[PDB]
Every structure is written in C-alpha cells, then in structure tokens.
Amino acid sequence: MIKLSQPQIPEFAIEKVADILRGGQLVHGDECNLFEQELAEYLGVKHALVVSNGTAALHLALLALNIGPGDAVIVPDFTFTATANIVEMVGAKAIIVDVDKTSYNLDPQKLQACINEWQGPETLKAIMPVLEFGNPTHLNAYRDIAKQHGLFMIEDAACALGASEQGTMVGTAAEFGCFSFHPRKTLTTGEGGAVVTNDTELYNKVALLRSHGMQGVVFKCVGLNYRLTNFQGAIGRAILPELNQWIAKRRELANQYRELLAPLVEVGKLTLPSIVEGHSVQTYMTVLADNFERSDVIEALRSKQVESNLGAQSMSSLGLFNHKYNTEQQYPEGTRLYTHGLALPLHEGMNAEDVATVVSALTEVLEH
Template identity: 75%
Template sequence: MIKLSQPQIPEDAIERVGDILRSGQLVHGDECNAFESELAAYLGAKHALVVSNGTAALHLALLALDIGPGDAVIVPDFTFTATANIVEITGAKAVIVDVERSSYNLDPIKLIECIENWNGPEKLKALMPVLEFGNPSNLNTYRQIAEKYNLNMIEDAACALGASDEGTKVGTAGDFGCFSFHPRKTLTTGEGGALVTNNTELFQKAALLRSHGMERSSEGVVFKCVGLNYRLTNFQGAIGRAILPHLNNWIAQRQELAAQYKEELSTLIDSKLITIPDVFIGHSVQTFMVVLASQLKRSDIIFELKAEGVESNLGAQSMSALGLFLHQQNIKTSYPVGQELYQQGLALPLHEGMTKDDVSNVVAALSLVLNNVTR
C-alpha cells in the first residue's frame, strides 16, 4: 500500500527521546526552549512558542489579541474545522469567505468585498488566512489587506512550515503565525504546534496564557493571569529539533514529486477528469490534492484506489457545508469553490519517503480507476 502520508522520524530523534525518558524531565524543559530558539531562527522571527497542538496555537493567538464575544474573524471556507471552531470557542463569530480555485486559499477579491460590505453587529477584528496544504499564495496580499483595513492577522499556517511568498516566510507576515506538528505535517512531533510573532508584548502575553498564567521568579511562582495548559513535552521538543535541519531538503523532495505528478497527470487533466492546483514557488506541498470532475463520486474512487494499493482521502472541509456556523452573513453568502473542493477534492499520496516509481504507480492506478468508472 502506498500510504497517503508517512511520518519521517530520524534515528537520532528516537535515541534522544530515549535519553529524555530515562532522565525523567518529561514536561516542557531545555529541549523545548532550544526548539523555540531554533524555530525562530529558521523563520527569521523574533519569538517562537511551542505548544501542545496547532489548535492551541490558534487559540492562544486569538486570546492574546483579546478576540472574544462581540468580535468577528474572517476564515476561509475550505480548511480543517479547527480554523473556524477555535474562533467560535472564544465567543467570537467565524465569518466565512470563499477560496480561489487555483490555490485553495482565501480569495483576495472576495475577502475585500466581505470587509467593505461588513454590517454585522460584531466588530470585524481579524482575518485568519489558511495557507492550505503549504501554499503561500497571496500571503503578502493578505498582510496588505489587513493593514489597509486595520485588522489583526493570524496566519493559520498549520500545513505550511517552510513555505514562503516572495521572500516572506509563512508565519511571519501577520501578528501571529500558527503551525501544527501533527503526523500529517512535514515536521511532526506526534501532536504539537507553535506560534511565532515579531511582537514582544504579544509573545509575553501568549507565553503566560500557555502555562496557567504562571511566571517563575527568584521568589517563586506568581500567577499573573487566568491561563491554560498548552505546553509541549520535552521529548516532543527533542523530536522537533532533530527534524528541523532536514526540513528544507524534505520540502525540495516534495516539490519534485509534485512536479512529477503534474507531468504524469497531464492526460487525465486534458481529458477533464481532474484538475490540479498551481504549485507556486515557495510551496511546501504538505498535501497534493486533485479535484475530480463533477460526474465522479469520490467515495467510489477512494475505494477503488485502495483495491489498487493506493491510499487516498478527502482534502479538507467546507465550513459553509458543515452546518455549524449558521450566522446571517454566512447563510446569505454562496461558496461554490469551497464546497466543490470539499465534495470533489482527492488527496493523493505525497511524502518525502516516496520514490518517483511510487508517484508513477499512483498515477497509473488513478488512470485505471478513472477510465474504468467513466466507460
């Protein structure tokens, strides 16, 4: 079976985890502190804060920006549900905007329309663009829009560590950038995540919120505010440190595999059985998702591909189609692109453990299945 995704854990990480387990220093410690410094340096950011998962990173960013009841945050229609869920958890309202067909990211034109036509009772306070599947497209444009309309910007860069837009590293364009280290991500610590910022005041606030509002001093522990427990473990920090030096090479491998997919899928594209995204310069290619033609039933394709030894799945969800965010603004707006991507998107295997032969085998299996079902 050619797997959809396969975490890569270097042997030195496994050995280091063993050392830490034997040491007894399991909670946030020196490895996490070092990982934060190395991650900030890699991104060219002033501060990085490692946390228990990517959703926790988003939550801390929202709380640090004082976003809550009476506020509204713009999110894309096509994303994992955590993006909109966490806005709602704060008491704010998730306002959905459709995405681009070419990039799967927030459509800048529709984003501006939403901002300029906003008349909800809530204060429109922030936008939360998702760099879907590692695609950096429009990152600098989102920043310009946020600045023009005086909005905070939180990058949901869960899939996009290592991606960049015209020299701007994903995660460093907004007030906060938030990453996930889930096993589907290029850098994984099992579960885990991080948020980065160039704003020292926001960093200090998020750091307090991450650990019970607690601050240690020579006089003992002081509780400065009401907080949460979103810390990463020390052995997870060690795994992240061991993987980070490999990240750029792994992304380069993913980009090569994506280019091969594009070339070998050309017949299916020309036959209008699938479309593929634009893989922009700077794309970290966490997932390679094609879009099936409307007459094809994705569940059937997934089943048939599995029989051919290829694992596949949907890409992400449409927030408007889930029936969870039924605010007036969302109900009266249409989301044709996001809903199509949700219904017809098919994620194909892509990870740095794959070979060129694996890609060819996936394409051969997909071609066989699609040709069979369209006869």
C-alpha cells in the same frame, strides 16, 4: 499501501526521547526552549513558542488578541474545521469567505468585499487566512488587506511550515503565525504546534496563557495548559534541519505528478493543484470531474494500495457557523473543493516510481 504521509523520526531523536524518559526532564525543558530558538531562526521571526497542537496555537493567538464574545473573525470556506471551530470556541463568530479555485486559499477580492460590507453587529477584529496544503499564495495580499482595514492577521499555517511568498516566510507576515506538528504535516511531534510573532508583548502574553498565567512564580492572569513535553520538543528539533530537503523532495514529486497526470487533465477528468514557488507541498490535492463519485474512487484506490482522501472541508457545508453573513453568501469554490477534491500520496519517503504507481492506479480507476 502508498500512504498520504509516513514521517520518519531520526533514530538519534528516538534515542534522545528514550534518554529523556529514563533520566531527563519530561515537562517543557531545554529541548523545547532550543526548538523555539531554532524555529525562530528558521523562520526569521523574533519569537516562537511551542504548544500542544496547531489548534492550541490558533486558540492562544485569539486569546492574546482579546478576540472573544461580541467579535468576528474571517475564515476561508475551504480548510480543516479547526480553523472555524476555534474562533467559535473563544465566543467569536466565524465569518466565511470563499477560496480561489486555483490556489485553494482565501480569495483576496472576496475578502475585500466581505470587509467592505461589514457593519456588525459583532466587532470584526481579524482575518485568519489558511495557507492551505502549504500554499503561500496571497500571503502578502492578506497582510496588506489586514493593514488597510485595521485588522489583526493570524496565519493558520498549520500545513505550511517552510513555505514562503515573495521573500516572506509563512507565519511571519503579521501579528501571529500558527503551525501544526500533526503527523500529516511533514514535521511531526506526534501532536504539537507553534505560535510565532515579531511582537514581544504578544509573545509574553502567549507564554503566560500557555501555562496557567505563570511568570518566585507569580500568577499574572488566568490561563490554560498548552505546554509541549520536553521529549516531543526533542523530536521536533531533530526533524527541523531536514525540513528544507524534505520540501525540495516533495516539490520534485509534485512535478512528476504534474507531468504524468497531464493526459487526465487534457480529457477533463481532473484539475491539478498549482504548486507555486514557495509551496511546501504538505498535501497534493487534485479535483475530480463532477461525473465521478469520489467516495467510490477512494475505495477503488485503496483496493490498489493507494491511500487517498478529501483534502479539507467546506465550512459553509457543515451547519456549524451560522452567522447571518454565511447564510447570505454562496461558496461554490470551497464547496467544489470539499465535494470533488482528491489528495494523492506525496511525502519525502516516496520516489518517482511511487508517483508513477499512483498515477497508474488513478488512471485505471477513472477509466472504469
């Protein structure tokens, strides 16, 4: 099976994990602390904190900004459901805005309109743009719009470690950046994530919330347990020095897809993602024409040893985010991407031959 992802954890990392299990510290220790330093340097950001997963990162960012009951956060329609769920979990309302059909990211003009029209009843406090599939497109615009309207910005950069727009590393534009180390997301720790910020007060607050309010040890506030193990930290920091080369490889494979898929684009059978400068290419998602039954395409591809899937969900389609605004607005772009999107294998373990294999299979399936 040509799989969507297959992260290869360096052998030296596996040996370090074994050493830690045998005779080392299991809870967050030197490996996590070094990983945080190294992430901060990689991103050019003042502070990083590693946490249990990327959902935990978003959760902590919301809590640290005192976003909760009575409040609202704008989210894109097209994303993994965690983005909207976590807003609701803190007691805030997820306010959905449609995405761009090209970038698959929150549409800046529709974002502006939403903010312009907002008059409650909840207090609108933040935007949570998603840099979907590693696409940094609109990062700087989101920052500008947030500043223009007095909003916080939490980047849901789950899929975007190593992406960048116009000199800005994704995750670093505003109050918080949130990353995932899930196995589909290029750098993995099995489960893991990170919160980054340039604001030391926000850093200190997340560090308290991550571990029971602990600062001898004093308990300064109520908190949670979102600590990452020391051995998970060891895995992550072993992979980080490889990430740029993995992204470069992914960009080369994306160009191969672009070249080889052109015949299908020309006859209107699918559209391609736009793998802009700075895209980290965590996912390569095409969009099938409406006349294809996507579930049947996925099944046929599986039978030809190609793993494929939808790329993400449409929040407005799920029936979970029922703020009035979301009932009033329409989300054709996110709905199209949710219904017709098709992610194809793209990861650093593949070569050009593997890309051609995938395109051959997809061409065959769409012919029949």
